Structure 1
Amino acid sequence: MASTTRLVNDRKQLEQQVKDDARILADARGLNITTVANDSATGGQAIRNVG
């Protein structure tokens, strides 16, 4: 049990830190939403009256 047994955990922590500090410097820009539309209807059979 030496400093070599901590290598995998060291890599786990290093990957977490790399992701975290690459998220900080990444530039973020808003995007335009162009998908709004009322196209989600439902079908079926009409309940026609009889008489």
Structure 2
Amino acid sequence: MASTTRLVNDRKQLEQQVKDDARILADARGLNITTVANDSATGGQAIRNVG
């Protein structure tokens, strides 16, 4: 039980803090949405009633 027995937990906390503080100052640039189309058709075989 000494200050050396906390290095891993301290590194975990520091990693989380640096991730948060890097995300805070990151510039946001909204990307234009493209590639929207109706191309999700469904195949299959017809029933073709007999008579």
TM-score normalised by L of structure 2: 0.97
Distance in 1 between the 2:27 and 2:2 partners? 41
Matched, 1:3 2:6: no
Could you list the structure 1 runs, at least 4 aligned residues long, displaced by more than 3 angstroms after superposition. Answer: none
Percent identical among aligned pairs is: 100
Structure 2: state its 5+ residue gaps. Answer: none
The alignment of Structure 1 onto Structure 2 pairs a total of residues equal to 51
- How far apart, CA to CA, are the structure 1 residues paired with 2:35 and 2:2? 57
RMSD of equivalent CA atoms: 0.4
Q: Which runs of 5+ in 1 are unaligned?
A: none
